[PDB]
Amino acid sequence: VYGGSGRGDLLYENPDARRHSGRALGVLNGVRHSSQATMPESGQLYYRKLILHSRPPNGSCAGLQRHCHDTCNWSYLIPSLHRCAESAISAKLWEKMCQLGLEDRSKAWVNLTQYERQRVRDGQNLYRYEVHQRLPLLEESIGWAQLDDLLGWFRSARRAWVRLPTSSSAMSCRLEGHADSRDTTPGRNQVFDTPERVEQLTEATVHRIREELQRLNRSERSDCEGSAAMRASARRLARDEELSRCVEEELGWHGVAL
Amino acid sequence: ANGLRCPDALITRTLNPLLNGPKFAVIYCGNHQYKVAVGDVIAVQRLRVEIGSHIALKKVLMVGGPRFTAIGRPLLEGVRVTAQVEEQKRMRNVVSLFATPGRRHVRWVDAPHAATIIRICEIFYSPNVVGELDKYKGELLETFTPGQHTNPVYPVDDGYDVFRKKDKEAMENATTFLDLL
Amino acid sequence: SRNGELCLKKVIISYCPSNGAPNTRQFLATHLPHFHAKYPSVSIDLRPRLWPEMAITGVYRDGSERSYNTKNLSPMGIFLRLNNLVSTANDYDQPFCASHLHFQRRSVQGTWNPWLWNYETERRRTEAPQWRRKLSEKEWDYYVGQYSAQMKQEE
Amino acid sequence: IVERMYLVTVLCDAGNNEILQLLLSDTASPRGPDFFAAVSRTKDTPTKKRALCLLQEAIDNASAKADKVTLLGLLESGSEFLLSLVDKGVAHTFATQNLFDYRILNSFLHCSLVADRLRVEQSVITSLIPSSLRDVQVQMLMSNERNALNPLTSPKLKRPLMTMLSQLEYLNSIDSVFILHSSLMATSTDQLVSAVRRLPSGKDSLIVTMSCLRALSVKSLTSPSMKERIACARALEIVSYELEKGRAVLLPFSEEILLHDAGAYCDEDLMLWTVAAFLARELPLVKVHTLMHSNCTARTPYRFLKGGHNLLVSSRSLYDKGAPLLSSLH
Amino acid sequence: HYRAKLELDRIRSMLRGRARLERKVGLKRLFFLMRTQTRYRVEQQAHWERAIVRKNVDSAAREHGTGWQHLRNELGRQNVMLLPRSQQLLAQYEPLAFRAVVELCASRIPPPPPPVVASVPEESYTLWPPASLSHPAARVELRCGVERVLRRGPSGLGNNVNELIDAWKEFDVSP
Amino acid sequence: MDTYVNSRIQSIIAENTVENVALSHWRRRHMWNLVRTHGKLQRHWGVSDATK
Amino acid sequence: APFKSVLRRHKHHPEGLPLYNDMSKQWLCREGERWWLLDARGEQLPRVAAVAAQYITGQHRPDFTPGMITGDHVVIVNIKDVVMVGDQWIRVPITWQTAYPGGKYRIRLTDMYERDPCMLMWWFLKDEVNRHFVRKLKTRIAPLEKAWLYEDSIHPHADKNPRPLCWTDPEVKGWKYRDPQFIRRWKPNEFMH
Amino acid sequence: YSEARSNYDGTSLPAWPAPGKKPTYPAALSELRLPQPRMRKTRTEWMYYHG
Amino acid sequence: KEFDEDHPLPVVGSRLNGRTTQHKWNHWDQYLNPQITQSIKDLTPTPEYVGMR
């Protein structure tokens, strides 16, 4: 878990399976006893620890003396989802979908080709996967998030055409599978109630957007009172108006109302 | 079930409370001698027993506790040492590599020593004493007195020996207490 | 199996329904009902696929994984390896030696320490005649007689 | 004076039984910190019980008289006494009913927004702390199975203060954990800065302890040079900021009592190693590092912190759950 | 010739320097190491191990006043049958038990008699039938067997022997 | 040495546990109580910024 | 792979050689350390050296482990009055080799005694130790430092309170002697029957 | 439980004499037809004697 | 052989029993039930032939 894939890595590497190699495993790095050759007893915790900690740091491991990228930041996680949505759905297809939806309210899908339908479905699937991956980092960074990225949280979902759940829509159901066979081993961050955690995360980020808007308004009012004059900047006025209209419209699109 | 029995009521009443508390047992099983305790686990040689089964160990060379110890020559009887088979698996592989420097023949023999891991659950001891036995004389005493020493022991200081290496005075002269009282 | 609870949780078995290698299918047909009736607690995850991995995986109750290779292996051997999987706990790996017979050390009477039998000194079986002692009349007569006898012989 | 004389005797390893009986039988005087520091060395169980009763009485008397210096000295001495005690249950009960954590944290330099936060959230961390620290892997696997079992088909979230015993499920997700050592703060804090730079990665975490924070405070208040004081003050404010933000992991004294083995004395040097041992024993798949100085003696435990030739400890005393954690440094 | 190459390749990480960098040098080193370790384990390890355990037991006996020689001889005499490993375990973890064993060896307690040879009961010479009853020797053998049954542990069969022997009479239905 | 072995015997008697740390560690950690520094900054029990 | 650095300490190096009594290595225990007193008045040199080494190396302890070098501090007193049987002080040679060519030094026990009486006891202790520990410099040097030799009877080790170690030589043996003849005491019942 | 077995039928001679009576002792010298030399029984001879 | 129904023998196997490859159809089986001969690998030559030198 140390060398292969971290906590918020979009990669999937089975740490005990060498599927990214162009050569048979000749030498075993982490070896404790001479009897580790004919039966390495790998998979046991006390030996896979040695092996995966003797493995060298990869591009995502960010070795000690090397700098470590800021990943737990909401202001970086939001543009990640936005760029993934842009990589999934192109601008032309996005405009076509927006026009079709605003014209027929999800009733004239026959105009879209089957290839475009499959592109939309694959984009929604990849967005759901990356949200499931970033969920712990998002719940970590929700504390000190900024209003722009809190709104981008809904902007990216709208762009990817994924309606967030609220107590098309693809975050409503879980992946089918019997709980007795599903993977539950510790150490691997894998949420099991995605429609239940993303919904409360959306509620929390709505409350956070409300708090940030109220904080901006209170700071503006305190500045005006300290100046003892009603002299507001045109940039600030236009920004407040456009951000209010934008948050209203983009939350009404998802279905959440302040 | 851990009580002592003897046709002498006095010695029975004297030795009954001395058989309480934790007890260890030196046992003989699988051609090996182990020292089992109330909660100690041991890996005995491969036994044809199903995992998660309660078993009892027959041979018991010795039993002991913080106050007593019963030896068996050669074996003991009345000791109920019950364990539970925790698992059954191979141990660490030993690789025997036989190579003759004269000829061209190398033999690689792997030996995974199979063994059953067990956890000793409970240990009970209930002996049948015959009577108080004298140490310095083979005669078996007909009476038992918990106050008087069954064998008085005296210091070793004669004075006849001039070169006798003298220890400290309190080490040479130090009586003992009475445990049975 | 510790305190009445199996350590092995899942047994992953991958096979193919039409390609070949009838060993795993023989195992699933003949010995799988017996194993499932013997150990209903473990969950057997069967995976049909085109190119199956000829290996059995055991996932235990602590995340540990133990895999056995069963390529062109008889279903009897497959059943034996499965029983070895459900028998082992796969929590450690220690050799078989005199120092490893007992997994943890403990004493009920007490651990030996240099000051346990340090002040205990040697003694004698019975009381020995002292050198500085008050001689009774009988001892006086005896020793004086011995002295006089040896002096008489010398004289 | 009599208490410090008894403490000097117990440091010379010859405890005056007469002085001890006098201090234990003479009432109408709250026992100072030296007495409870000296009693911590002895192993007499009724002596420790009577010392615990006297400690409760003296803490109540100090709280009534509102003497901060005496209260803090008594807090430190009683902390050492609770670490030396055997019954972890009564030790944790005493700690949580006398409120050692909040009062001790109020004494540090910039540890106030974390002190009051811990005092507020102590009701939830206690519930999140599990019962037995044995088979933590199995416990969290059972929790994962429970979470996977959806009960439905078959409130506003606020991230609380980071604590190891409560967030055991978070360290297994964390790949690398750096445990801080007070001796690191010598002539510079850039190593601690580089440590806290890796926290926003989501993979690296930082573990500080109350013992380490107390060591930092005392070495910032007394030291031969001024660079040491400045660096330790800067490190204290950095650690306080990281804790109040919710990135580094803190060990309250209650959790320290619950984690450390029974009857074993612990300090800034032994606590690091017992935490490392607990991590390597219960959470094997997390890479643990120690941020120590190139001159600290606790860097090599098997030669400096090792005890004597003890027959009840073998070379495998770490990978077994029956042996105490401090049995690993052999 | 079967050179253990594919097996010993995976242990090269234990070596250092050129033996770990290059392949053949490390393979030669590992081959020689395993061969000499097997030879030592077969022909020379047991000697050193038993010498160590014997020295420990001798020191534990000398701290009490005896030696390995006399202790071993008297253990063989008293027929205690305790291996040197168990003697060392007792000396290290049960000093009171080891001291009691030493006191037993030192005292003049009569060692157990040799095992009695299996004898034939006197009833085997009785004419049977003397002219539907059981053989007397067989009945005595059954009685001794039931006695040995009841002698091993407590069971709900009871301490009496006649009622347990006469169980066929109970199972028999009155005609 | 006599006082040391007496204290050690008493500890072995009344411990009812296992001791695995060095016995001199506590003395090395509390040597600040034995020594005395007459500087402006002298360490005492419960020293904190609220005190100074 | 373990690795010992080539840059080791040396006798010409200013850092110097350490004292194992002051060292703090892992394989060096100091808790279970007792102080024994051994008077060498009359006792022979090899016998007293063996008796001292058996307590120095810690072989008398039941938990003795070859790796862990633990032992007791033996204070040998009255080495100046040590006794060897006749003609040995003159006939027993002590030889060694130096780096110079033909430097085969050969001294008598008398010469080594008139030079320094403690040197003889130290040499015999070194021999009795190297009898079992000669492979590792640690295992062959660390025990020797636990011996406290003293020529005269005075010694500064009065605080440690050394116990007067008692030891019996393996030479004591009673050869069969003639059964002494004495008068028999009869009995009235024996004379009656 | 346990088994104290020396022969097939678990019977043995009375190991403990009457209270006050002199106990019986085995032969310490080896079974040698010559009186000289008198040799103590080794442990292997003791094992052979005990069975 | 088991003494009771409650305590059956374990299923731990030896090397002889474990190290056993799959069964290939032999001439007796192919002559008894010719439904198994479905491929060219089933047409094995005379069992007297061991193989190449």
Ligand SMILES: [Mg+2]
């Ligand atoms: Mg062998």
